[PDB]
């Protein structure tokens, strides 16, 4: 879909890059970024917060003639260790798979917000970029990024410049 990320974009996880007659640069899409952050932050906290250990004491002492019990205690510790290790490894891998897909989904949704908003006033070129058929100055770029773009306003210029 998109080849890689941007390093000049340092104000959030998701965003826009623009170039127009008056300037160029990067800016975060704050609503998208903050929602992704809150979702993920809560996810991480849930993984941690849900475990609630009781005050305990793990070690036990057995004597010369209590080997069967000592071995029972070992059996218990080993069983619990395998369960926790196995579940912990899988939980992390599963959550990581989803976190990364989650982020990819949000990028696509950001793209669609713009594609739907611009319609025929911009050429869709690829790799996350659009080109306006009509002149689109800083005021225009902000209205597209903000979801407030007026399609009809520029439709005459855009179709004239299409052919």
């Amino acid at each position: 879909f998109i080849e890689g990320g941007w390093t000049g974009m340092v104000d959030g996880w998701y965003g826009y890059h623009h170039q127009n007659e008056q300037g160029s640069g990067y800016a975060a899409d704050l609503k998208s970024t903050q929602n992704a952050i809150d979702k993920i932050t809560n996810k991480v906290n849930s993984v941690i917060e849900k475990m609630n250990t009781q005050f305990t004491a793990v070690g036990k002492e057995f004597n010369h003639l209590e080997k069967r019990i000592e071995n029972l205690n070992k059996k218990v510790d080993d069983g619990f260790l395998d369960i926790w290790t196995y579940n912990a490894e899988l939980l992390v891998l599963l959550e990581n798979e989803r976190t990364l897909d989650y982020h990819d989904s949000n990028v696509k949704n950001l793209y669609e917000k713009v594609r739907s908003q611009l319609k025929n006033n911009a050429k869709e070129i690829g790799n996350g970029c659009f080109e306006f058929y009509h002149k689109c100055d800083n005021t225009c770029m902000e209205s597209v990024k903000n979801g407030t773009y007026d399609y009809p306003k520029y439709s005459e210029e855009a179709k004239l410049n299409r052919e």
């Epitope: 000049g8 170039q19 007659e21 160029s24 640069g25 050429k123 790799n127 058929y133």
Partner: antibody
């Protein structure tokens, strides 16, 4: 890979057609620009066109006077210089831009 | 836009001597910078395409470095082949692309 024609010189108030043809590049996947080197001066960027032809930029110093068009089927880039001034006498170069347009644009082929 | 200047208008060292050039921006570039070496009568050649990352076909003699506004070109050993005019461009902010004036490197 790229042949350039500077259009020769005319007196101020006149006009010139400049033209470049490229054979070592697709000229459909790459943007192009013009850079002007006046004798005794530094290197000045003048103008830019994307391969879609929908996107063009000019230096303030040439706005309203210079214009760019291209024809991808001919591998050619054209620049029309109108209302020429003494200050416009310079060596003009055609430069093939980087492929990675939205980020790193460093003019790798002259 | 971003104004680029180059202070060491003349850099003149003996053959084989290490030498450097500086570039300064009025605004933060964040390594979105490129360096060129121009032989008289020629279009400039790209030597470093990032502020520090070397362009294809360029020898180890050249490398760069830099930060937000200050950039450096290092020539580890100036060769008889290297007298040239050097330039910095920027591409961080570019309706137009901009360049600094450029400086000359010469051999004693």
């Amino acid at each position: 890979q790229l042949v350039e024609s500077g259009g020769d010189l005319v007196q101020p108030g006149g006009s010139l057609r400049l033209s470049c043809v490229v054979s070592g590049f697709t000229f459909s996947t790459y943007s192009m620009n013009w850079v002007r080197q006046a004798p005794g001066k530094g290197l000045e960027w003048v103008s830019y066109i994307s391969s879609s032809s929908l996107s063009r930029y000019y230096a303030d110093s040439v706005k309203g006077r210079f214009t760019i068009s291209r024809d991808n089927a001919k591998n050619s880039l054209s620049l029309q210089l109108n209302s020429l001034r003494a200050e416009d006498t310079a060596v003009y170069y055609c430069v093939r831009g980087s492929i990675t347009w939205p980020t790193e644009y460093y003019l790798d082929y002259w | 836009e971003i104004v680029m200047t180059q202070s060491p208008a003349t850099l003149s060292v003996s053959p084989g001597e290490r030498a450097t050039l500086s570039c300064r921006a009025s605004q933060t570039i964040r390594s979105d910078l490129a360096w060129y070496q121009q032989k008289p009568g020629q279009p400039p050649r790209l030597i470093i395409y990032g502020a520090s990352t070397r362009a294809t076909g360029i020898p180890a003699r050249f490398s760069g470095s830099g930060s937000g506004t200050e950039f450096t070109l290092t020539i580890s050993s100036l060769q008889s082949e290297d007298s040239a005019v050097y330039f910095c461009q920027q591409y961080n902010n570019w309706p137009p692309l901009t360049f600094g004036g450029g400086t000359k490197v010469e051999i004693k």
